[PDB]
Design a protein around this ligand. Structure first.
Ligand code: SF4
Ligand code: SF4
Lengths: 420, 415, 420, 414
């Protein structure tokens, strides 16, 4: 038993929901209690979606104890198929259903539908959202990807992008265009904006761009054997990170690194004279594993901050972090307790925090500038405007986002200082 | 054209899109200043509360969830030891808390983890500074606002006993409203009147054989049940929504308490005019418009009753998560006859009814509203209507407001 | 004499400076006192430029009275030519020099350089920055534009964009894009990113797209005679505005209106359910003439605010405004006194103000949500990230910009209400 | 290797990139709590102050400009009625003001509109609740920090008269620093000691035949001239930048007031070590680096004197808007001999002398700083050094710091 107010991650079935929603023509059935369909809200309000999530529930209640429950998941799967007619489906258990007898494999097998139905292993008492996302996607790729002959031209897949993904939309956009600048067109971006039909056509692309380790690295791994596909290990957030990502791609493809840097304004901005008081402002960095490693290289090497703290809430990424953190003379902080994060930030005593909605809130409490660099995030951070993190325009966005809270801080200090 | 008592209610089961009773905590905690609601459940439970409390989560709310970990599943004698010491740790970390509620979840109940002994033991260990109760909010027992009921009802058996004949108004209300309510009841001549729940735990109303109580809220079946079992007798009334609602509501207490139409008209006169006028501003956009309501809060009947009667809307399908026949009787009397009633839901059946219905305005949950807006149906998300002040006279305009606005906006967005 | 703290506009020579800098291979010589070169600072800091403004000064001081002054402007023009070798030049008086006798025509005539040197009339006691911008640009076009045969394909110019222009960079970008979607490529964008060489080649484009009335409508007018060029009258800020602009263009070129609406997210955003409480929130609008007329259509017709005040500081645009304002049942407020703006906002009592760095500060003083929609503006509003106002992506920016202060306003009310 | 008294200073004319004396109002309105600085000038003048005051403009600063309109050019009589009304308006609509400075612009002076008599006249009308002075901030007459001088010198002829032998510290200072200065000077045994300008008008130093005074700031040519004319004797000293500066500055006062070399060494001891140490932190990135300074503040020479001696920097060309032979003497004597000196400038000539020199660090104005960074030179923008606390001991660290920071940043980005 852990006393819990804030959580950084949902339970694993959200991660499932998050992958199923990313896809088109795909139905997910969750065995779970009535009243437990709340996650709708996240996809329809926070992401701002126009159709209902492609997710259905068996919606059992108190007066349904007895093997009554297996039969309910059956008719849930039945109904979902009859009604929507999806190229494939996938089935799993909510945390409550995990404590019940009914088996997602056995009921799926018995009933026996026309299309593939994938049963998912979601340990909802030991794992979380991000795992859910990865497994669910591992399992879909594992079931649907087959060896194939490579495209005539050079192509790749974008692995990892999802529903409720923090700037996923626009990162896909921005990566597509920086690949296109090197002659490389995209095969299939998945899970996001992909059908099961498309998931079979995976084999034919030379390499995989692993966009988000946290959401599609298992799938990247599985594809390493299945169709002998090498995934990119360097995630392109920041300029240096992007250059190295492009060089890594040149290494994978043989192709010469071509860049369209005509709109890249961050290096000059940060090189500018108004940027000089940024020099070694102490920043504390918290968030999802991938964005913290990215932020810190920008912070120290592209903006000239002193990274004074570094950590993440997802266990899954603790070693990539602990490694990187050391490089900055720092001991990573792996925690999902925000009360810990609050303790760390007070200890580090930074002048700027970069984190999640929670850190924005701690920062508010402590009267410190702050920017948001990672999920979980509210509606604010699924903007209508174009706002990637990755690549060049992404590097612009990041510089503007992070510098603002600080400029405002100065303007606040000054104005009150001279009020009296 | 105005009466529904003999209408057959579609008693419906199937796939559901509702909130469990846990959600209710999010708004209860506010009214009961002295209390902490400690859910015993899974990370699903925690994440739910998070989603439902939006921004409030950052305001050190006084609720939280003891999230069941993998090693709590087997060995269910640890369960009590684990909780015991997780509770004390919390009761040290916020000493101002006086009522602790062990709110039970689906997980907690599948494990037939008996919260009731736990509630009783903890009460001893932590006496007499903090008294700890227990009730269910598990999706299995409870839909959305039923969580207030199961809560209040659990508190009722332990209230101090009494002789005197005083009014208890049942249902947590926005504070401001509660006062307007107090005020009018006084001016009618109704000596001592209390709220359940109270603002603090030291001013909990007593009950006895001579106590009368009235419902501020439709979703209070069990609490009514428990109060009756203490010998206190209910007062029937349609729920105070609109001028007609509020008036009859007052009228019902007036009658039972022997108050002259004289003192009634002279008290009630000023405020009834206020209301009727404020409401009138919305008639233009609202009269003639057809209304469909999915189930969420048990508020859909009396709200539909106000919308059709005082706003001149046409009720299509009104749907409620539960339908207490005896309690809902006055409002059903006033509801248009042509109205299909649904207890419970089979989402897909319902969505299919509404598709070929094509109503003007459609009242629903947040996971439906947008999908439905993208289809060209106007929506008015329902959750708002628990927490916004909407009862009684002063809020009558604002209430109608809440349903005009979405339509006003729709027109506006294409000429 | 008018007691003046804040000014919305510089003196006309900044306007000159503003047009000179927008161009390449053009030198401007200002007769003016020593110490009066401060304007660099705007172009170098605010706009963030990498070379010094192509602007030089005669830099006379106290011990220079006597006709000693004419000689100084002579050798200023001489030196500037010798040193930089620009295709052409332009010469003007700062306000101090306007009260002296040396005349910019007579000295430029006498000296007689290889390239054209354009003398400018800048009534610095009657007019302001915006006029300065227009006249200087009128004068340059009037001297350098000549009739010409139309391009083989359909082409147009972008008239009005300048240095220190609020979102001019990205607006040029965004408009080029939406023209290219209709088959129409751009001939020469001027003053911005144009040389004198380019200004001669104006005649060959079918029509002029007047981007900013305030900065290049004189030039638009003069080109209406010169090479019988019709300028677009509808400025594309907002979706409706942009659609009408595109229709206006189809009317001018004959070509069918084609739109790439795949990234246009504003309509759905505001159509969505969390946009419902936006309905009729009272907004006061102030700023440069053009951005106020644009804002107000969006405000009332695309977002569903109630426009509660409307006005501008730019007397040049008072009629365009007074007309539009009336259509909202409102009396335009034409003032350059910010103390009037403060009174009007208090009278109107809006829930949201949209205006200038000044209005931002009035808003702050009154605890009211606020967005910046118009120059004058500080460094924060010359962003690194892509941020146009015009066209589709522009419409997305505007929606995010304007809603944010409000959603934060609510978040702040709620959190303190809850504290309690 | 250390001495510059006989160096020929390049007395230079031509195209300029400097601020007029108006800018000084910014900066010094803050120190004089009681005062309002009302420029009579054009919208150029208004817009300049705006640019210079950045965000301060929103803080209801106590300055503003009566901007000359078309109808004030002809003729010069309407002008005054007009002004009076604008001034009267200003004085009723903030009664706190007690001294009103008519600050003079280029335009007003080209219009020959006599602010001297106006100030004389307004004093009557609005006496005795407000004293109204007048001085010049016009670019013709004045460069940046000269604005303070002209002002302070206008205040002098009017100060109360006295006999007593008090010390007067002339120069506006960050309040912080003001107190540090005051404190050291007090525990040294030197009472009493006043500041010019004072924080409020009712506590203005009085001046007499036995008054001694010292310059906190190198840009006070006229104010010395004026204090001298009322019988007050200057105390020469290098300016207090760095540990050495602050020491000699103290030393010079302590000499002239006959303090023991022992009460001095006891009082000054702790602070001086605290400083040499703070400076140590910067020694690493700073030693060896070549410095260039364009003209702006008149603080170029003493700061350059500080950076070379205490931070081991090579001076190349140190340029100044005005060079006072008598005042700059003690600093010039401690400035390295290898040093080129410029008074005034020809912007374009300098830019060639600079490009050919390729200095490590360049100290310059904001209009020049980025185009020099994009062109490959590290810079430190000058205006900072006027408003940031930098004088005396406790501020020496931060001072060195202001100069290391950019070089540190330039390394850090490659
Ligand atoms: S109590 Fe039941 S409905 Fe509520 S979150 Fe837990 S499992 Fe879902
Ligand atoms: S230099 Fe002269 S004209 Fe220019 S702003 Fe200063 S006082 Fe005014």
């Amino acid at each position: 038993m852990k006393l819990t107010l804030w959580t950084y991650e949902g339970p694993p079935h959200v991660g499932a929901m998050r992958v199923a929603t990313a896809m088109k023509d795909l139905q997910l059935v969750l065995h779970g209690p009535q009243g437990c369909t709340y996650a709708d809200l996240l996809f329809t309000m926070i992401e701002r979606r126009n159709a209902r999530p492609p997710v259905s529930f068996s919606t059992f209640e108190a007066s349904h104890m007895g093997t009554d429950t297996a039969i309910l998941l059956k008719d849930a799967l039945a109904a979902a198929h009859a009604r929507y007619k999806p190229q494939a489906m996938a089935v799993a258990l909510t945390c409550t259903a995990e404590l019940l007898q009914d088996d997602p494999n056995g009921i799926s097998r018995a009933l026996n539908l026309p299309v593939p139905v994938v049963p998912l292993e979601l340990p909802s008492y030991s794992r979380k959202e991000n795992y859910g996302a990865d497994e669910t996607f591992r399992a879909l790729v594992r079931a649907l990807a087959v060896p194939m002959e490579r495209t005539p031209e050079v192509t790749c897949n974008l692995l990892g992008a999802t529903a409720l993904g923090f700037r996923h939309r626009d990162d896909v956009a921005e990566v597509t265009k920086l690949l296109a600048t090197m002659g490389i067109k995209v095969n299939v971006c998945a899970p996001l904006g992909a059908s099961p039909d498309d998931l079979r056509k995976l084999g034919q692309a030379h390499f995989n761009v692993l966009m988000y380790p946290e959401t599609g690295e298992s799938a990247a791994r599985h594809l390493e054997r299945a169709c002998k596909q090498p995934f990119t290990k360097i995630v392109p957030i920041g300029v240096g990170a992007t250059r190295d990502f492009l060089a890594e791609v040149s290494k994978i493809t043989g192709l010469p690194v071509v860049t369209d840097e005509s709109t890249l304004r961050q290096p000059w901005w940060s090189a500018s004279v108004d940027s000089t008081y940024l020099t070694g402002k102490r920043v504390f960095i918290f968030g999802d594993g991938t964005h913290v490693i990215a932020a810190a290289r920008i912070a120290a090497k592209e903006v000239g901050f002193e990274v004074v703290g570094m950590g993440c809430y997802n266990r899954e990424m603790a070693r990539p972090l602990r490694t990187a953190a050391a490089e900055y003379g720092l001991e990573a902080l792996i925690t999902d307790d925000y009360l810990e994060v609050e303790k760390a930030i007070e200890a580090a005593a930074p002048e700027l925090i970069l984190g999640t909605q929670m850190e924005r809130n701690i920062a508010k409490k402590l009267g410190l500038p702050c920017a948001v660099i990672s999920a979980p995030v509210h509606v604010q951070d699924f903007p209508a405007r174009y706002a990637p993190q990755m690549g060049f325009e992404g590097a612009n966005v990041l510089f503007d986002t992070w510098v603002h809270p600080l400029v405002m801080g100065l303007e606040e200090h000054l104005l009150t200082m001279f009020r009296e | 054209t105005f009466g529904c008592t003999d209408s057959p209610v579609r008693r419906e089961r199937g796939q559901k899109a509702v909130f469990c009773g846990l959600t209710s905590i999010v708004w209860l905690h506010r009214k009961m200043q002295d209390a902490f609601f400690l859910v015993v459940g899974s990370r699903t439970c925690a994440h739910l509360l998070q989603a439902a409390a939006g921004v409030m989560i950052f305001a050190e709310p006084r609720f939280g969830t003891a999230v069941l970990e993998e090693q709590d599943l087997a060995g269910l004698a640890d369960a009590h030891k684990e909780l015991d010491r997780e509770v004390a740790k919390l009761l040290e970390r916020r000493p101002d808390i006086r009522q602790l509620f062990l709110v039970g979840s689906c997980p907690s109940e599948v494990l037939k983890l008996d919260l009731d002994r736990a509630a009783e033991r903890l009460s001893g260990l932590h006496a007499p500074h903090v008294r700890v109760y227990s009730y269910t909010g598990s999706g299995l027992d409870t839909t959305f606002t039923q969580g207030e009921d199961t809560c209040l009802a659990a508190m009722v058996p332990t209230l101090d006993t009494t002789e005197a004949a005083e009014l208890i108004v049942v249902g947590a209300l926005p504070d401001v409203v509660e006062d307007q309510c107090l005020s009018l009841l006084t001016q009618l001549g109704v000596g001592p009147v209390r709220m359940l729940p109270a603002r603090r735990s030291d001013i909990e109303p007593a009950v006895g054989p001579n106590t009368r109580f009235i419902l501020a809220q439709p979703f209070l079946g069990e609490t009514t049940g428990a109060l009756e079992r203490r010998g206190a007798k209910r007062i029937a009334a349609p729920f105070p929504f609109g001028e007609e609602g509020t008036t009859l509501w007052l009228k019902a207490v007036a009658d039972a308490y022997g108050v002259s139409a004289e003192k009634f008209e002279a008290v009630t006169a000023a405020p009834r005019a206020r209301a009727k006028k404020a409401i009138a501003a919305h008639l233009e956009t609202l009269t003639g418009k057809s209304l469909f309501m999915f189930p969420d809060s048990q508020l859909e009947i009396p709200l539909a009753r106000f919308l059709a009667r005082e706003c001149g809307m046409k009720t299509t399908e009104i749907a409620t998560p539960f339908l207490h026949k005896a309690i809902m009787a006055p409002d059903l009397a006033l509801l248009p006859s042509n109205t299909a009633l649904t207890e419970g839901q089979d989402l897909e059946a319902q969505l299919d009814r509404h598709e070929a219905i094509n109503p003007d305005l459609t009242v629903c949950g947040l996971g439906l509203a947008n999908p439905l807006e993208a289809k060209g149906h106007a929506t008015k998300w329902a959750i708002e209507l628990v927490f916004t002040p909407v009862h009684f006279y002063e809020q009558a305009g604002d209430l109608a407001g809440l349903f005009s606005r979405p339509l006003r906006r729709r027109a506006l967005l294409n000429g």
